[PDB]
DNA sequence: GACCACGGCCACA
DNA sequence: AACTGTGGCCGTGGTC
């Protein structure tokens, strides 16, 4: 199994290293034959002898063009005559590439910014994280003595905790009577203990939580102070820091540094993303938090150090459990993209797509288009139309069905050969025209993108058959992971075509897919209403809720499957409407805001305040109890009782302040904000106090009793004292609880005045 | 000063 | 999952 690849420099020549895991042993493969290269397009092939001799400087060393080679490749379906430029070292490219482009005899250069180690995986056709081998893992966390106002890593690291299959342990340099604590003389010997432990276990994966921005940075500062060779790498190297935009990421050569924070933040939606909140949301168990003000006091006074050691032990223990949950999914995603788990776990969906396309474009001799320049990106700022959004028939409905399409946009791309290499191609025989936009796509040859989506969805169906026959839950869970990720990948390729900074950007291909989706959707809602007498209540892009007015439950499920047979014979090719599920009742408030309940009792809410993080828990809890009384029993009397009970408890200040916290995220620097809302007002006051507010910080404020602007009365929930503070019960009643529940109860004539 | 567009956030698919 | 795109909603300051 391939873990990752990089390259070292031996006598000036590049040597690819392939970190592998075979037969339960860590191996390293060396390759001294791979040569860096990028392509160039010239006005006249005679200029190759002039373009052979451009030189540039690098580290005071003149860079040369090693050799040239003529090749025929496919640039958007069309064969082109492109020249291949070879170089001695990868870093020779960024020094000479701009001078080659500025040569008058050239038109453009292609595939010049591709990293060497990633280029090796693509050209050699190697796929990481492939195989049956099991990886040995180890999570770790640290604890530091924190004082305000001091520099970063000014205080020493007090405890280092690690956890794996054998359990969790804590290394510390003060005596603590606990069975999992290993005591040490000093901090330096505490650190040196951790290196020896990591070296002995020899883990393939090191699991952290926000270790890209803190743990490795803190250990790096201390190791330089105490003169420690932090040789965590399998080759004796030290942790390497890479820049990830406004942040950093840490590498450990030979191993995989799996930071859970970027993986968890994108795979889950929570109000706060503290390690305690993530653990309780995933495993349903409370994890106790001990703040740095408690760590420092307990350490400097030497009192109650077991309570802090238990927090350190649990940190690494829950980090290991979260690691075993999110890594198999991300490992299969790495096998699909064809890149290392380190890069995949920290990359945007767009970059993952361009990695998949670049690997696929290499297998088909397809020259990759370059990233758009500044001026081209300006011409790509035109907005196109999305999917059909029907204004829902407001109110409560009974006995309904939802019928969706099986992968709407990938099916449209496959069926109609939607691709930038097929758009308006002169001289074909079979054309397909898109509605409204009128774009034509040749079909004599399968397009580049429809071939990939066709190959992907074919594999996905093959995986599902292999999945249901698999007996061991392990591969069944992994096959389920792969067949899942394939669906998201195929749908993500469509969005790539509409992205301004995409290599395979095609606005015409994008809007044509949405135009076809609107046609096929509006036709089925028209067929199901005129032929079978259904009533489409709500529709969004690729599905709709419908029923026959005043019909019986089995009669709905009967004629619904009749309509499915009729519409699937009329749908062309890969397009397919399917039966998703039946639900007894369902309330529809507005666009992208509804809630249904099946015959089993499970309620699925969409878009309502229940699923939003910027709403108080008291308002989300009340709206849920109201929906449970209606969707399950239809007892509107129980719902109006619930609301009046909550408001009275709020009016008497008897509701816990924890349920009244509002969580809003900061997205930019506080100077960029042109409108200062409540969560920005409290953040600016905080920054004046000294605390750093970073883009992405989650603010948790509470509104206090008073008058005027809300921002002038909102304090962070850190500073709320029940003996000293009283929240604005008037605000939470009339601006949170009542507005949220009244949108539903207004369907029964109940006004907010009747809800108090 | 009631009325309103509007940043700003997050959600649906 | 969500770069593509479509919407609901609120606290806030601008308006005449
Ligand atoms: Mg290129
Ligand atoms: Mg890398």
PDB file of N, CA and C and ligand atoms in Angstrom, chain A residues 39 75 109-114 119 358 367-371 503, ligand 1:
ATOM      1  N   UNK A  39       4.672  21.116 -21.091  1.00  0.00           N
ATOM      2  CA  UNK A  39       4.443  21.216 -22.524  1.00  0.00           C
ATOM      3  C   UNK A  39       4.492  22.667 -22.992  1.00  0.00           C
ATOM      4  N   UNK A  75      -6.205  18.191 -27.408  1.00  0.00           N
ATOM      5  CA  UNK A  75      -6.582  19.413 -26.699  1.00  0.00           C
ATOM      6  C   UNK A  75      -8.055  19.676 -26.985  1.00  0.00           C
ATOM      7  N   UNK A 109       2.055  27.664 -22.530  1.00  0.00           N
ATOM      8  CA  UNK A 109       2.660  26.506 -21.886  1.00  0.00           C
ATOM      9  C   UNK A 109       1.596  25.821 -21.042  1.00  0.00           C
ATOM     10  N   UNK A 110       1.731  24.506 -20.890  1.00  0.00           N
ATOM     11  CA  UNK A 110       0.718  23.702 -20.223  1.00  0.00           C
ATOM     12  C   UNK A 110       1.361  22.737 -19.238  1.00  0.00           C
ATOM     13  N   UNK A 111       0.651  22.498 -18.131  1.00  0.00           N
ATOM     14  CA  UNK A 111       1.045  21.519 -17.115  1.00  0.00           C
ATOM     15  C   UNK A 111       2.413  21.854 -16.518  1.00  0.00           C
ATOM     16  N   UNK A 112       2.594  23.128 -16.166  1.00  0.00           N
ATOM     17  CA  UNK A 112       3.861  23.611 -15.633  1.00  0.00           C
ATOM     18  C   UNK A 112       3.890  23.706 -14.114  1.00  0.00           C
ATOM     19  N   UNK A 113       2.732  23.803 -13.460  1.00  0.00           N
ATOM     20  CA  UNK A 113       2.665  24.000 -12.018  1.00  0.00           C
ATOM     21  C   UNK A 113       2.324  22.720 -11.264  1.00  0.00           C
ATOM     22  N   UNK A 114       2.479  21.564 -11.897  1.00  0.00           N
ATOM     23  CA  UNK A 114       2.143  20.308 -11.234  1.00  0.00           C
ATOM     24  C   UNK A 114       3.319  19.838 -10.385  1.00  0.00           C
ATOM     25  N   UNK A 119       2.915  14.425  -9.733  1.00  0.00           N
ATOM     26  CA  UNK A 119       3.074  14.067 -11.139  1.00  0.00           C
ATOM     27  C   UNK A 119       3.565  12.633 -11.297  1.00  0.00           C
ATOM     28  N   UNK A 358      -7.028  15.493 -13.902  1.00  0.00           N
ATOM     29  CA  UNK A 358      -5.665  15.462 -14.425  1.00  0.00           C
ATOM     30  C   UNK A 358      -5.165  14.033 -14.585  1.00  0.00           C
ATOM     31  N   UNK A 367      -4.329  16.818 -23.368  1.00  0.00           N
ATOM     32  CA  UNK A 367      -3.586  17.939 -22.806  1.00  0.00           C
ATOM     33  C   UNK A 367      -4.487  18.765 -21.898  1.00  0.00           C
ATOM     34  N   UNK A 368      -3.995  19.065 -20.707  1.00  0.00           N
ATOM     35  CA  UNK A 368      -4.805  19.759 -19.715  1.00  0.00           C
ATOM     36  C   UNK A 368      -4.824  21.257 -19.998  1.00  0.00           C
ATOM     37  N   UNK A 369      -5.999  21.882 -20.061  1.00  0.00           N
ATOM     38  CA  UNK A 369      -6.047  23.345 -20.167  1.00  0.00           C
ATOM     39  C   UNK A 369      -5.494  23.998 -18.909  1.00  0.00           C
ATOM     40  N   UNK A 370      -4.943  25.194 -19.080  1.00  0.00           N
ATOM     41  CA  UNK A 370      -4.323  25.897 -17.970  1.00  0.00           C
ATOM     42  C   UNK A 370      -5.377  26.562 -17.089  1.00  0.00           C
ATOM     43  N   UNK A 371      -4.960  26.922 -15.880  1.00  0.00           N
ATOM     44  CA  UNK A 371      -5.803  27.729 -15.014  1.00  0.00           C
ATOM     45  C   UNK A 371      -6.092  29.068 -15.696  1.00  0.00           C
ATOM     46  N   UNK A 503      -9.994  24.315 -14.829  1.00  0.00           N
ATOM     47  CA  UNK A 503      -9.281  24.038 -16.070  1.00  0.00           C
ATOM     48  C   UNK A 503     -10.253  23.646 -17.177  1.00  0.00           C
TER      49      UNK A 503
HETATM   50 MG1  LIG D   1      -1.956  22.597 -17.922  1.00  0.00          MG
END
